[PDB]
A paper describes a structure:
HSF2-DBD was crystallized in complex with a canonical three-site HSE, 21 bp with a 5′-overhang. The structure refined at 1.75 Å reveals an HSF2 trimer bound to the three nGAAn repeats in unambiguous electron density. The DNA in the crystal was packed in a head-to-tail manner, where the 5′-overhung adenine in one strand formed a standard Watson-Crick base pair with the 5′-overhung thymine in the complementary strand from a neighboring asymmetric unit. In this structure, an HSF2 trimer binds to a tripartite HSE motif with one-to-one occupancy between the DBDs and the nGAAn repeats. All DBDs sit on one-half of DNA and are spatially arranged like an equilateral triangle seen from the top. Noticeably, the C-terminal peptide of each DBD stretches toward the triangle center across the DNA axis and obviously positions the downstream coiled coil at an approximate 3-fold symmetry axis, which relates the three DBDs within a single trimer. Exceptionally, the side chain of Arg109 close to the C terminus in DBD II deeply inserts into the major groove and engages in a direct hydrogen bond with the purine preceding TTC. This arginine in the other two DBDs, however, contacts two neighboring nucleobases by bifurcated solvent-mediated hydrogen bonds (S4C and, S4D). Likewise, the wing domain in HSF2 DBD I, albeit not entirely visible in electron density, is engaged in a similar hydrogen bond network with DBD III. In the HSF2 trimer-binding structure, however, obvious bending is observed at the 5′-proximal TTC triplet bound by DBD I rather than the downstream purine-pyrimidine base pair, while the DNA at the other two binding sites remains a relatively linear shape.
Residue numbers in the entry:
A (entry chain C): 7 to 74, 88 to 111
B (entry chain B): 7 to 80, 85 to 112
C (entry chain A): 1 to 74, 86 to 112
Write the structure that this text describes.
DNA sequence: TGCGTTCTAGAATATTCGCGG
DNA sequence: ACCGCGAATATTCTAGAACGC
């Protein structure tokens, strides 16, 4: 599993980040509750940038889609099912 | 068991090196906690060099893989390596680790 | 503060690192201007690299050097050379090419 | 024939920028 | 500003290759 996916799983799963990024209620998507604080305070703790656009570029590269707080989903990104991450293949 | 693996086992297992190189908390991988001091103060006591890169090349020659460190963005952090046959309390598995041949 | 806008960031930053005097404690031209020296690989990687790049790994700095065609000149300084990386000849930087595998 | 050290390269992922809309 | 996406470069991790023993 590439670093982006395992870090993203950790971010969403960990409760100590839940003020800015968390599973949706049913566990099928994740929410960014405060984009600006997420990008300025959380992104540089796990990635080499503080740029929401570079996070979103990676979401696109891994096939995530925005859901109509911002919400993203991937069929193989589900609460309690980290074994499924191996199914997610980055775009070339 | 070639010298690299027995020396690596002793390095990880020994408590007195644990500031530099230690089992991870699950015992399925090992950590190098201070890469610079490990390379300059530990490596040349066990090997003919003081270069982390030459240690790392050997780790990969023996089939070890680097573990992603989750909380690494932006006092250097740990580096973690794992091998299915390098496990705390299971030194009987070391004989199964065969170096790649060039 | 690097400033060679016409070449990739790595070469512009490398030129500034070598040329600027306040970094000469870490990285500087060799005496004849034909190569550059990293004087203390440990201090350079920990104190200088993350001020200019998104990492503090000598190996990733060296990967870039080789990718742009630099060769190591074979404890102490490490020395790297490129025919087109030369003191007083910044017009040659744009002849340095990034290798493609 | 195999192991150790060094230097360089392959390939994948990661970050940024810019384009058209 | 967004949004999807191509492209250039950066960074990481592993491997190739030369050479000594
Ligand atoms: Na969370
Ligand atoms: Na130890
Ligand atoms: Na300098």
């Amino acid at each position: 599993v590439p670093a982006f996916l395992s870090k993203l799983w950790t971010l969403v799963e960990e409760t100590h980040t839940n003020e800015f990024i968390t599973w949706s209620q049913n566990g099928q998507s994740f929410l960014v509750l405060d984009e600006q604080r997420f990008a300025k305070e959380i992104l540089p703790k796990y990635f080499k940038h503080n740029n929401m656009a570079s996070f979103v570029r990676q979401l696109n590269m891994y096939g995530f889609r925005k859901v109509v707080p911002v919400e993203f989903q991937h069929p193989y990104f589900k609460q309690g099912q980290d074994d499924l991450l191996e199914n997610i293949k980055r775009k070339v």
